Design a protein around this ligand. Structure first.
Ligand SMILES: Cc1ccc(C)c(NC(=O)Nc2cc(S(N)(=O)=O)ccc2O)c1
Ligand SMILES: [Zn+2]
Length: 257
């Protein structure tokens, strides 16, 4: 059992998960003076089918929007990949206040939230369960979210939260293309990393967008409005779910720009 509280939070994660102190841990601080431009990086190509949208689930520490991943209807290609990767999920991370909330930071700057759009290597592997722990198994697009104007594209997601207010609650969530949440420029950083929460597998090639997306202070309050408790128990709001940044351990962050 793990979380983002005092006793079960990021600090204690190595007790159950020793890879927490590994050499390919996420998230990281992207230092733009220390990044290395790479001319071999292809553009990011996302092509999602809105019909693959499936379900929204309250997982206690966060909420997930899951996607049907039986075929290649919704794929990521390009960037640093020769393989095609299949969309399975998106979710968010946020903080207790507007001051923090993102997982990744750029030149020490914390943003208010972060969108993760996650994919698995369907070219090399047969399932998410198989891919999830492979070095080249996962591809996650990270988009930093800056507090400002209300993001209208965020609407269908925020509206759906009313149906999944407490832990374990789930509801159908259909006909949504999550590339509509992505910024207009897909200029990016890329580095070898991990899942940002248990089980923390070093299976993720991160794609971090240069361009942020907006979110209002009230849209953030909707995230924090979700409850970590089961129905009938007294309310425990999901205040924050971001992991602190991790030492790069000689890894190199590549820029596409
Ligand atoms: C037990 C187990 C096995 C396999 C996976 C994928 C998980 N992961 C999750 O529950 N969430 C998650 C976190 C990230 S993130 N925050 O690192 O971008 C990306 C994709 C996600 O699915 C857990
Ligand atoms: Zn995440």
């Amino acid at each position: 059992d793990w979380g983002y509280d005092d006793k079960n939070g990021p600090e204690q994660w190595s007790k159950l998960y020793p890879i927490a102190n590994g050499n390919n841990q996420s998230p990281v601080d992207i230092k733009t003076s220390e990044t290395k431009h790479d001319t071999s990086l292809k553009p990011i190509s996302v092509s999602y089918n809105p019909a693959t949208a499936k379900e929204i689930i309250n997982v206690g520490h966060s909420f997930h929007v899951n996607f049907e991943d039986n075929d290649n209807r919704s794929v990521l290609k390009g960037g640093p990949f020769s393989d095609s990767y299949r969309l399975f999920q998106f979710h968010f991370h946020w903080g207790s206040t507007n001051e923090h909330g993102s997982e990744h930071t750029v030149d020490g700057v914390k943003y208010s939230a972060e969108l993760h759009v996650a994919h698995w290597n369907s070219a090399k592997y047969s399932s998410l369960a198989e891919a999830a722990s492979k070095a080249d198994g996962l591809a996650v697009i990270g988009v930093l979210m800056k507090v400002g104007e209300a993001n209208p594209k965020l609407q269908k997601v925020l509206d759906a939260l009313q149906a999944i207010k407490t832990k374990g609650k789930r509801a159908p969530f259909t006909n949504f293309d999550p590339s509509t949440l992505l910024p207009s420029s897909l200029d990016f950083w890329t580095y070898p990393g991990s899942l940002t929460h248990p089980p923390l597998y070093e299976s993720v090639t991160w794609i971090i967008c240069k361009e942020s997306i907006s979110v209002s202070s009230e849209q953030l309050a909707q995230f924090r409005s979700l409850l970590s408790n089961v129905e009938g128990d007294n309310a425990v709001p999901m205040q924050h779910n971001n992991r602190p940044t991790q030492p790069l351990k000689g890894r190199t962050v590549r820029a596409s720009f």
